[PDB]
Amino acid sequence: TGLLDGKRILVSGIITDSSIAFHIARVAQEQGAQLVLTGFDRLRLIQRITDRLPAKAPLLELDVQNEEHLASLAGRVTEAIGAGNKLDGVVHSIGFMPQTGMGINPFFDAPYADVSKGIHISAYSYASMAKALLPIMNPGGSIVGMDFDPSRAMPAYNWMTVAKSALESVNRFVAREAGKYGVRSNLVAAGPIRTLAMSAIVGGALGEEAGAQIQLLEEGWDQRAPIGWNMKDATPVAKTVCALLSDWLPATTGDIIYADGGAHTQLL
Amino acid sequence: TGLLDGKRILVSGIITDSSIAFHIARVAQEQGAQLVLTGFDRLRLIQRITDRLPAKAPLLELDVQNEEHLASLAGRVTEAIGAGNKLDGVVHSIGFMPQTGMGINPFFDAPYADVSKGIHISAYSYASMAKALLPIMNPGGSIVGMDFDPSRAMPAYNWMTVAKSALESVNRFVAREAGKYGVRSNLVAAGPIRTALGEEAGAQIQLLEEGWDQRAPIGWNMKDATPVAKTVCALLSDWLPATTGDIIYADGGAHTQLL
Amino acid sequence: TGLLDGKRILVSGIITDSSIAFHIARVAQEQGAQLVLTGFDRLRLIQRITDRLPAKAPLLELDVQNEEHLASLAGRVTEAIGAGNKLDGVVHSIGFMPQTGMGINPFFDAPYADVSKGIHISAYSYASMAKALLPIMNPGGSIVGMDFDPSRAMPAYNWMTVAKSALESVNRFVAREAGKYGVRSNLVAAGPIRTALGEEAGAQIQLLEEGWDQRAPIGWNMKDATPVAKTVCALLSDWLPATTGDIIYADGGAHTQLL
Amino acid sequence: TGLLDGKRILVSGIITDSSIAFHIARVAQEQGAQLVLTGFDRLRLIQRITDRLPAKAPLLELDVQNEEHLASLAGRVTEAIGAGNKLDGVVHSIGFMPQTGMGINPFFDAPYADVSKGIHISAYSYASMAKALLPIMNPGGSIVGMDFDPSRAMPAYNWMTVAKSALESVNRFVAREAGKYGVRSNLVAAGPIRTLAMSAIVGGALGEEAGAQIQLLEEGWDQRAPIGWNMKDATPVAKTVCALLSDWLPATTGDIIYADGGAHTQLL
Numbered sequence A, D: 001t002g003l004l005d006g007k008r009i010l011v012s013g014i015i016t017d018s019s020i021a022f023h024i025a026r027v028a029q030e031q032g033a034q035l036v037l038t039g040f041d042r043l044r045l046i047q048r049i050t051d052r053l054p055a056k057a058p059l060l061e062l063d064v065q066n067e068e069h070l071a072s073l074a075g076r077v078t079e080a081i082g083a084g085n086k087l088d089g090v091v092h093s094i095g096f097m098p099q100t101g102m103g104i105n106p107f108f109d110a111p112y113a114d115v116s117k118g119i120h121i122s123a124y125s126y127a128s129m130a131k132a133l134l135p136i137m138n139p140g141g142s143i144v145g146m147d148f149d150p151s152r153a154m155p156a157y158n159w160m161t162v163a164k165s166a167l168e169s170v171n172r173f174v175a176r177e178a179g180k181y182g183v184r185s186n187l188v189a190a191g192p193i194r195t196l197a198m199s200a201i202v203g204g205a206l207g208e209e210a211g212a213q214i215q216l217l218e219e220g221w222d223q224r225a226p227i228g229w230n231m232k233d234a235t236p237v238a239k240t241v242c243a244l245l246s247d248w249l250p251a252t253t254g255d256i257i258y259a260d261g262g263a264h265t266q267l268l
Numbered sequence B, C: 001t002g003l004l005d006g007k008r009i010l011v012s013g014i015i016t017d018s019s020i021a022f023h024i025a026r027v028a029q030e031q032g033a034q035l036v037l038t039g040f041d042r043l044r045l046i047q048r049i050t051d052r053l054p055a056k057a058p059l060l061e062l063d064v065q066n067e068e069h070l071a072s073l074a075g076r077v078t079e080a081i082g083a084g085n086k087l088d089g090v091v092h093s094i095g096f097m098p099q100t101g102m103g104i105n106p107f108f109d110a111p112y113a114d115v116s117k118g119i120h121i122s123a124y125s126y127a128s129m130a131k132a133l134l135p136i137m138n139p140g141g142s143i144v145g146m147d148f149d150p151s152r153a154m155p156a157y158n159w160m161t162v163a164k165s166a167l168e169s170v171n172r173f174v175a176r177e178a179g180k181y182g183v184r185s186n187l188v189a190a191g192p193i194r195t196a197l198g199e200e201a202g203a204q205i206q207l208l209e210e211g212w213d214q215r216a217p218i219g220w221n222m223k224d225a226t227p228v229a230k231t232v233c234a235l236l237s238d239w240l241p242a243t244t245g246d247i248i249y250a251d252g253g254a255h256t257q258l259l
């Protein structure tokens, strides 16, 4: 049978077929998980994408900034999975940061309203999503978010890095809350994955300064990674998340698991 | 002679005489530094307090949330220290967080507008302050801010801990920008210092504070901010010229010990 | 089907039925793995114990200090699993340290020959074991060893903590060598598990152990090694194919919490 | 006056004029510190070198493996500084590792007797040196050793990296011991410094594989370092040690201070 048999897992974050949450959903379903998906803006668009999944699953609207979406989320899920049923897994795979705070723009030229908006979506929403769903979660359940190692600074990532340093702090705190329900909360720190913005800067959407930079950071990842790293394959990352959602890591919470090919453990 | 002779150092954060920034200023002055102090809201009040310092130094108004204070900050400092003169050191010792996101309030009940306000004052202001002053800073200068180890979660500190996780990340980036000026940028992670909440808090804080002194191999006195103020001066000095984007712990070593 | 179906996994470290390696083997077998077990000194004794496992598996002699056991290890495994067959997983669950360098003895009174013996068995043997078996391992295989967070110092554990700081460093290097074979290499940092020393120890261990369960957001039961044995199996499986040279914590989250 | 006025500091580790301990001594003396030096093998040779210091200081023999040198060390120092006088600072700047465990040799081909010998000298000796001198140290005193960030693996450094991971663990423990005497114990994690072996592999003492590698790791250090890093200047490292020996860091022990130009805090 499948890694996640008879587990009901909410997976947010799907926008395209290159999304990390798309492959987290695909694998979860491949491992026999009943899913519940959420989407942010282009619900019609994500309907077309989510239809390309192994199995049919309810799709709810969730704008983590929206105070109404959050207040109503549990009940909507209750309706979708069926009264008397609970969640065994929540996948937070949400991120955002205006151009001002990430990319070619000077680190010091990001206005706070932009940084604030990105932290809200990339860091605080993890707590508010756990606050909504914790109540309708089963003991032994698992909440996992996506992270990008922010231990050290780097070019381009700038204020996103500061948002991810927030998310890791938030995660350890959400573990406190989540423990009172016997639920774990961890983050999967993945190496770079080609999606849209990052698989666009290739040719040079950001210019010759950028491109040739990210193309360097990415490149070095595959060298540093003792088992290597293919930025065009989001499957290994997705499987790590499934391992976190499963029951084979029942004593690990408030933590961070690194799906980056070991790159973060090697200097050169 | 003093550790910081001839150094023009801007020091923010004083509000009372218990303020970590008060002792930083007091020690920097004792070590022969020319200070420029900034205050946030109660300028008259902090005038009373800053008058209790070893030496007289210009007091400017700075509210890190105010876009006008920031844009003008450099020019006003230039006028206080004199045209042609530049700063050798900047002390960010600013911290805030509404009760909603820190204390007895449940962690999940902090509304973002609050959390966001606290991160703006506690984390982002470090970058915006650096962005303002970096241009009027001398090579080999030092920017140092205050921190409280947010590596692990804990009761009460809650969202402040999240704001500090942000500062440390901001600091590594400010080190990048500051490098372009030959300027370092580090954080000093101090143990708790004394500067109502009920029986849970008076139990927790006095239990967390207590265990600090136990864990600390040299011990920890929460009623003395001097050890911390000296660590900030060592950072402002020239005896740590190769360290930037880093964090120096003035905590009695508590953070290196488990029990 | 099981997590580790069709996987040939070598598991060392069993000595009693409380041994973390016993439950690792028990769980790997419950998840349909073909095991090859190794034992150190009391082979007859561990035969009695290994007979208490779900399934029957070959038991080889391995004393990581013995240069002959190491050189022959591959060939003997080849013969047990069959020529042409290779290993998919190696479990290093070996640990030692004389009383001199761990327990009530003062930290400064541990003679090197002792400390060196403990590091040889507890740290270096991880590399020498990897060097022996890596050649008879399949791509996508997994080497996992046991660890106890040595980030911070603590009473009693003393030089074992130093030996574990070494293992973690050894592990990052074994990840390099192992990568050349498409093999991962990680450590599982478990909370204390039950497997005389006087009133100080019975006070400390029961105080350190106790506070573990408090710190742990999901709690921690030192009388149950199963959660730990499952984490080792998740590492041996294929649901963590992108993680190597790393450390997975099976400790109830205790290490992410301060108080 | 000087940073270390009227402080009596033992400084070991001087073998040549490029030694990190040579500059730690030179600066300490420049800051008005009474020194006590120790040497390992070529005492005659180090006599010639130590004579090139700002000021005259007693030179004792200390082979950290030798059980006799350790047992007699305090008394010899007592004699050199004068009965009734104590040390205010100890500088551990000792390292060793046979070619087998560091360089071009395969990581797996280092025999334990070699690794053991290097850990003994590079890690355990820090404890045994503190065990000898702690008794003749003043409250407020400072014990500092030299370290090289071993968080992540790297080429060439191999078993030395494993020795430094040991030393950092040892350091936190020595802090326990050292606290009972009101003495601090920290490590200075420096970036690479041209000495003898490392300033030899330049041309290619280790070959074209090496050289072009270390020359890469070194190079990248100066790029990653936001204030940059000059591998030909050991002065900034020495001054950090003096800051640790001084009284301007009285609340930091069992810790590690990084003198590497910030390189360890930057990814690219």
Ligand SMILES: NC(=O)c1ccc[n+]([C@@H]2O[C@H](COP(=O)([O-])OP(=O)(O)OC[C@H]3O[C@@H](n4cnc5c(N)ncnc54)[C@H](O)[C@@H]3O)[C@@H](O)[C@H]2O)c1
Binding pocket: A012, A013, A014, A015, A016, A018, A019, A020, A021, A039, A040, A041, A062, A063, A064, A065, A093, A094, A095, A096, A121, A146, A147, A148, A189, A190, A191, A192, A193, A194, A195, A196, A198
């Ligand atoms: N792609 C990578 O290289 C990689 C690596 C490390 C971490 N991550 C993290 O994984 C997560 C998703 O990454 P991805 O690469 O799949 O990105 P993506 O661009 O494919 O998806 C980002 C998601 O955020 C959603 N979103 C934005 N604002 C929202 C809001 N207001 N309310 C609800 N949803 C909102 C978008 O709809 C989108 O699905 C992010 O946290 C990202 O930082 C990605």
Ligand SMILES: NC(=O)c1ccc[n+]([C@@H]2O[C@H](COP(=O)([O-])OP(=O)(O)OC[C@H]3O[C@@H](n4cnc5c(N)ncnc54)[C@H](O)[C@@H]3O)[C@@H](O)[C@H]2O)c1
Binding pocket: B012, B013, B014, B015, B016, B018, B019, B020, B021, B039, B040, B041, B062, B063, B064, B065, B093, B094, B095, B096, B121, B146, B147, B148, B189, B190, B191, B192, B193, B194, B195
């Ligand atoms: N007190 C402790 O136990 C301790 C321990 C570790 C770190 N710190 C840090 O040191 C710093 C100062 O701490 P403190 O204990 O002296 O606290 P304090 O309350 O005495 O100082 C905090 C300062 O923040 C200033 N401030 C608030 N909003 C501002 C704004 N909008 N613009 C400019 N200034 C503003 C206040 O005027 C005040 O001077 C903080 O960052 C804090 O996190 C304190």
Ligand SMILES: NC(=O)c1ccc[n+]([C@@H]2O[C@H](COP(=O)([O-])OP(=O)(O)OC[C@H]3O[C@@H](n4cnc5c(N)ncnc54)[C@H](O)[C@@H]3O)[C@@H](O)[C@H]2O)c1
Binding pocket: C012, C013, C014, C015, C016, C018, C019, C020, C021, C039, C040, C041, C062, C063, C064, C065, C093, C094, C095, C096, C121, C146, C147, C148, C189, C190, C191, C192, C193, C194, C195
């Ligand atoms: N027990 C705990 O609380 C706990 C917690 C964290 C980590 N660990 C780690 O797990 C591993 C095993 O722990 P355990 O509690 O099962 O202890 P155990 O005493 O049951 O197992 C230790 C094993 O080391 C073996 N061993 C000793 N010398 C050997 C040698 N020369 N060659 C081959 N094998 C040798 C012994 O035979 C024994 O099986 C150790 O590395 C230990 O550090 C244990």
Ligand SMILES: NC(=O)c1ccc[n+]([C@@H]2O[C@H](COP(=O)([O-])OP(=O)(O)OC[C@H]3O[C@@H](n4cnc5c(N)ncnc54)[C@H](O)[C@@H]3O)[C@@H](O)[C@H]2O)c1
Binding pocket: D012, D013, D014, D015, D016, D018, D019, D020, D021, D039, D040, D041, D062, D063, D064, D065, D093, D094, D095, D096, D121, D146, D147, D148, D189, D190, D191, D192, D193, D194, D195, D196, D198
């Ligand atoms: N040089 C660097 O790039 C750098 C960077 C980081 C850390 N460090 C550390 O600084 C320390 C010294 O480095 P260095 O570059 O000055 O090296 P060096 O080669 O100049 O000196 C190493 C010292 O070890 C001494 N020594 C060796 N065995 C001894 C023993 N048996 N008993 C007593 N003394 C013994 C030698 O006599 C020598 O002085 C080492 O710990 C080293 O790892 C150096």
Ligand SMILES: CCCCCc1ccc(Oc2ccccc2)c(O)c1
Binding pocket: A095, A096, A097, A147, A148, A155, A156, A157, A160, A191, A192, A193, A198, A214
């Ligand atoms: C730009 C630097 C390369 C880092 C890799 C990377 C790529 C995408 C990332 O995720 C984002 C998704 C939406 C908004 C912001 C970020 C990220 O986490 C990490």
Ligand SMILES: CCCCCc1ccc(Oc2ccccc2)c(O)c1
Binding pocket: B095, B096, B097, B103, B147, B148, B156, B157, B160, B191, B192, B193, B205
């Ligand atoms: C109640 C929290 C216990 C931790 C000790 C502590 C106390 C005060 C702290 O500083 C603050 C000052 C103003 C606003 C926010 C934070 C802190 O850093 C650390």
Ligand SMILES: CCCCCc1ccc(Oc2ccccc2)c(O)c1
Binding pocket: C095, C096, C097, C103, C147, C148, C156, C157, C160, C191, C192, C193, C205
């Ligand atoms: C007494 C130490 C408290 C820590 C808990 C603990 C207990 C046993 C441990 O494992 C050992 C087994 C054999 C030899 C050395 C170590 C350990 O890892 C961790």
Ligand SMILES: CCCCCc1ccc(Oc2ccccc2)c(O)c1
Binding pocket: D095, D096, D097, D147, D148, D155, D156, D157, D160, D191, D192, D193, D198, D214
């Ligand atoms: C070889 C890789 C470059 C690392 C920089 C470096 C250079 C010298 C180092 O110190 C040594 C001194 C004596 C014996 C062994 C090591 C080191 O610590 C760190």
